[PDB]
Amino acid sequence: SEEPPISLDLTXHLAREVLEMARAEQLAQQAHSNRKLMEII
């Protein structure tokens, strides 16, 4: 903690990558995995 939050601020934009993409891949894996498993039950 010395320099300004430049990397944090820019990460704000890129949150639509590491949080949107990550969250999507989780919802997608856990949509189709869950759907394939649940389709069996």
Dist CA 41 CA 37 (whole Å) = 7
What does the alpha-carbon distance between residue 38 and residue 25 come to, in Å, rounded to a whole number?
A: 19
Residue type, 21: M
The CA radius of gyration of the chain, in Å to the nearest whole number, is 17
Which phi and psi (to 5°) does residue 25 adopt? -60, -35
The separation between CA 35 and the C-alpha centre of its own chain, rounded to angstroms, equals 20
Q: What is the DSSP string of the chain?
A: --S-SHHHHHHHHHHHHHTHHHHHHHHHHHHHHHHHHHHH-
Cα gap 25→30, rounded to integer Å? 8
Distance CA 31, CA 4 (A): 39
Report the 10 Å Cβ neighbour count for 38: 8
C-alpha triplet 14, 28, 17: angle, nearest 5°: 5
